[PDB]
Amino acid sequence: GHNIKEDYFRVDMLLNKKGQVILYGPPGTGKTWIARKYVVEETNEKTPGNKWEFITFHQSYSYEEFIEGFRPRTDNEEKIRYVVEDGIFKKIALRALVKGLFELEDATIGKDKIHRLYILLTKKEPLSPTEYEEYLRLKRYLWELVGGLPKDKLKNLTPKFYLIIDEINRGNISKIFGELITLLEKDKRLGGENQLIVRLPYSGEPFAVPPNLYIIGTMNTADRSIALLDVALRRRFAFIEVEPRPEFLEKENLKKIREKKLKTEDRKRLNEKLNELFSKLGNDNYFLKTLLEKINVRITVVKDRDHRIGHSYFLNVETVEDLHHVWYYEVLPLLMEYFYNDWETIKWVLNEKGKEHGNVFFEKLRLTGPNGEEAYQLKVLEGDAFIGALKRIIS
């Protein structure tokens, strides 16, 4: 566990510096897993909702679901009404500020009004209209109290809150982070040196990010072009590259990961299958380490480093048919997606460029078109043909 307590340390140190980090890298490097496991370690809570939240950005995700928007709600007599519902960032930023105003031993904080605002912020059913007006009234009291409160107490808000934004580059981040371009910076937060309270358009309410709120984003850098991010938005985040680590794919490292969550009688039954799998690979304990390193260097030369193959696909491989599944349903469709069905480039990545019609992963069709077009076809190899074609990539 020496390598997990330093990737924890990169996230923990840079979240204190920038307030918000982005774990970027190709899909399958454990970015969502690192972000979730860091937060469950820091916030001692396995489930989201109290001191951390999990959100995933998609193409249809908007400012209105994230910050605030006019939203059709219903009454207790279920008649439709149009109110301004706070989004998931605003609900956790107000939660981080109000829970941070709990422990502040000040004689000006109305703890009965602050605790009642905490209950309405931690209420998970939608608010009744008689308590939605109480919720607007206590938020109106909150920014009246926060605006007349000094930076000596506002910067030391003690319980840290976390927002995992998975697949953050899959959304239009500048549109979703409406006022959060300005507000998320560590100087611009509450208690900061350049503390900024913004006015939101839909509610007309004051808003600012508290300092005890942290945002860990995950970016699959092969699912969206990283040269399409805003440079000014890039200034708000520390960017931690989470690269493929094929050193996790050695036989001892495969054992050291898969025995942290299962019993001992299931451990050596899993170990005899891992010894059976690696025996069929030439008794090479560094086989899947060398196989992933060789294809990722070959990907990096003819594509990006962002389009490398992650290590998490081979991480639950314990049989040859588990490796046969991962190669033909997690690697080879992923190589065909990254290279846009360029068969000559993939076969150079798979070390089979001048080799067709044999024990290859892409056989050439014997027919040629009228324009001289050649087509290649994925060949499913089983048994010794599959292992002998994976050994061809290493050799």
Ligand X SMILES: Nc1nc2c(ncn2[C@@H]2O[C@H](COP(=O)(O)OP(=O)(O)OP(O)(O)=S)[C@@H](O)[C@H]2O)c(=O)[nH]1
372 is in an annotated binding site: no
Nearest distance, CB of residue 284 and its own copies, angstroms: 21
Q: Dig out the tokens for 209 from the structure.
A: 């990010």
Closest CB to ligand GDP among 37 and 392?
A: 37
86 is in an annotated binding site: no
Q: Which stretch binds ligand X (CB under 6 A): 27-35, 289-297, 336-344, 376-384?
A: 27-35
The entry of Mg ion, ligand GDP, another protein, none near residue 345 (CB within 5 to 8 angstroms by kind) is: another protein
Query: Of 160, 142, 209, 154, whose CA–CA distance to 51 is shortest?
Result: 160
Nearest distance, CB of residue 310 and ligand GDP, angstroms: 6
Contact 164, 218 (CB under 8 A): yes
Interface residue with ligand X among 195, 212, 220, 290 (CB under 6 A) is: 220
* Residue 58 in the binding site for ligand X (CB under 6 A): no
Q: Using CB atoms within 10 A of its CB, is residue 146 exposed (0-12), middle (13-18) or buried (19+)?
A: buried
Closest CB to ligand GDP among 37 and 391?
A: 37
* Residue 72 in the binding site for another protein (CB under 8 A): yes
Number of residues this chain uses to bind ligand GDP (CB under 6 A): 15
Closest CB to its own copies among 8 and 202?
A: 202
If you count them, how many residues does the chain have? 395
Q: Using CB atoms within 10 A of its CB, is residue 313 exposed (0-12), middle (13-18) or buried (19+)?
A: buried
Q: Dig out the tokens for 4 from the structure.
A: 């997990």
In Å, the largest CA–CA distance within the chain is: 86
DSSP notation for 26-57: STTSSHHHHHHHHHHHHS--SSSSSSEEEEE-
For the window 251-290, what string marks contact with another protein as x by the rule CB under 8 A?
----------------------------------------
* Residue 32 in the binding site for ligand X (CB under 6 A): yes
Binding-site entries for Mg(2+): 32, 166-167
Q: Which residues bind another protein (CB under 8 A)?
A: 59-60, 62-65, 69-72, 80, 82, 172, 175, 202, 222-231, 302-304, 338-342, 345, 369-373
Binding-site entries: 28-33, 166-167, 187, 311
